[PDB]
Swiss-Prot record:
A lipid is attached at C322, C323 (S-palmitoyl cysteine). It comes from Bos taurus. It is a multi-pass membrane protein. The keyword Transmembrane helix applies. Residues 62-73, 134-152, 225-252 are cytoplasmic. The modification N6-(retinylidene)lysine is found at K296. Phosphorylated on some or all of the serine and threonine residues present in the C-terminal region. Its main location: membrane. This is Rhodopsin. The chain crosses the membrane at residues 37-61, 74-96, 111-133, 153-173, 203-224, 253-274, 287-308. Expressed in rod-shaped photoreceptor cells in the retina that mediate vision in dim light (at protein level). Disulfide bonds join C110-C187.
């Protein structure tokens, strides 16, 4: 008797006192004090105020600078759009619901907010996977007669949308489901109940294998091989101080990107490990949503790492912000 069940929700709070209410109807101030809902709102406001400008500016400077519109940069624009889906499908709705203390848009809005927020995060995840694959192909040259062009980059972008849809769409039609989660102000995949009517168990396995294990392996393999190839070529040209300088910065950047990916990935692994190692206590709204809570900031630091640290985008952003000068 850990929470309270109802049609389309699971409030992680016991109803022996009789105070639990539908998260679609009344504020959940027994899960958390009102000031903590306000802090959830303040957190959403921070993500909005940092997330929108950085990601919109990425799309904007690409319009003004011809040299950014190269096929290898298409996946980065896809990343920027995905973060905007998270900013407007998730953060802004959650800022609005948190100030009410519950999900005021009903079960239909729960599927909408759940779908688009899950879609945004999925497109971003697979954009990082596709970018790793593309860089591996260009550098390690595993295909002998291959040249990466416009059609290939479009293929990679469409691939992320397909992978994002095959995660975000099944809960709309009977495999798992979308319900309020955590403090019940935002909606997502039901990892919290074993709803047999929608076969939640098998969807969690499928999420774990395809959308969690595989992205980590691909990112690690591609960047591992890329670093190996680059170190290998630089070893054959140690008389070039710039070759060694480029090798050091490629390695340093791959380390930064892998560590950033692990900072978002490991919390899920730790919490899932705890849920399956102990598996004997009730998990409050906060605990099993802690990985999701901190993974939201990826809408801010991913464009910082993949775009603002790119030498091209940075100078074009400075030129755009400073009205064409400097
Ligand atoms: C967590 O647990 C709490 C406590 O159990 C639940 O809250 C209760 O929910 C029930 C509804 O399931 C509330 O029901 C009350 O009784 C009447 C319902 O209509 C009945 O009317 C008669 C009497 O039985 C019959 O025709 C028929 O059986 C109907 O089922 C209403 O009359 C009540 O309305 C209010 O006004 C009347 C006067 O009209 C007052 O006298 C009543 O006291 C009442 O306040 C009401 O609908 C019950 O009141 C709820 N209790 C509390 C404390 O809120 C939650 O549902 C549960 N949470 C979740 C998420 O499931
Ligand atoms: C993009 C999200 C839609 C998706 C996501 O939210 N989940 C999938 C992974 C998850 C938690 C739910 O599923 C799991 C199933 C079982 C065990 C652990 C699990 O972790 C995601 C989030 C962060 C990363 Cl890095 C990768 C994927
Ligand atoms: C951009 C920010 C918009 C915030 C809108 C917040 C509207 C809050 O609305 C309030 O919600 C309470 C439930 O907690 C109700 O009791 C109040 O009657 C209602 O006015
Ligand atoms: C390196 C990974 C970058 C993308 C991270 C995306 C994080 C998405 O996080 C997910 O968001 C959903 C909607 O809010 C929630 O329902 C899920 O519980 C949460 O894990
Ligand atoms: C998933 C891809 C991660 C690649 C991380 C590669 C980090 C390698 O980093 C390099 O390691 C060498 C020893 O192996 C050291 O001699 C170098 O100084 C160091 O730059
Ligand atoms: C670091 C301080 C605790 C952070 C974890 C707080 C967990 C509250 O749970 C939160 O509920 C919100 C409303 O549904 C969701 O939008 C968040 O994804 C979820 O983490
Ligand atoms: C190039 O940058 C020349 C233009 C001068 C811009 C300087 C002003 C930028 C200030 C950005 C920080 C805004 C802070 C708002 C905090 C709420």
């Amino acid at each position: 008797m850990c929470g309270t069940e109802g049609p389309n929700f699971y409030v992680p709070f016991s109803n022996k006192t009789g105070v639990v209410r539908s998260p679609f109807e009344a504020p959940q101030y027994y899960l958390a004090e009102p000031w903590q809902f306000s802090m959830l709102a303040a957190y959403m406001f921070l993500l909005i105020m940092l997330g929108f400008p950085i990601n919109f500016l990425t799309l904007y400077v690409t319009v003004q600078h011809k040299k950014l519109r190269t096929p290898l940069n298409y996946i980065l624009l896809n990343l920027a759009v995905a973060d905007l889906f998270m900013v407007f499908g998730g953060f802004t709705t959650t800022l609005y619901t948190s100030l009410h203390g519950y999900f005021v848009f009903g079960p239909t809005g729960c599927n909408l907010e759940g779908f688009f927020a899950t879609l945004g995060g999925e497109i971003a995840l697979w954009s990082l996977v596709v970018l790793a694959i593309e860089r591996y192909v260009v550098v390690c040259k595993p295909m002998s007669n291959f040249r990466f062009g416009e059609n290939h980059a479009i293929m990679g972008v469409a691939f992320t949308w397909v992978m994002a849809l095959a995660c975000a769409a099944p809960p709309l039609v009977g495999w798992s489901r979308y319900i309020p989660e955590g403090m019940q102000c935002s909606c997502g995949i039901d990892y919290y109940t074993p709803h047999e009517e929608t076969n939640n168990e098998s969807f969690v396995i499928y999420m774990f294998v395809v959308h969690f294990i595989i992205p980590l392996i691909v990112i690690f393999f591609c960047y591992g091989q890329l670093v190996f190839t680059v170190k290998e070529a630089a070893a054959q040209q140690q008389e070039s101080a710039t070759t060694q300088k480029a090798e050091k910065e490629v390695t340093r950047m791959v380390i930064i990107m892998v560590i950033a990916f692990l900072i978002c990935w490991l919390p899920y692994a730790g919490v899932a490990f705890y849920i399956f190692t102990h598996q004997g206590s009730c998990f409050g709204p906060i605990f099993m949503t802690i990985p999701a809570f901190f993974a939201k900031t990826s809408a801010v630091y991913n464009p910082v790492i993949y775009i603002m640290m790119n030498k091209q985008f940075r100078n074009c952003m400075v030129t755009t912000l400073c009205c064409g000068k400097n």
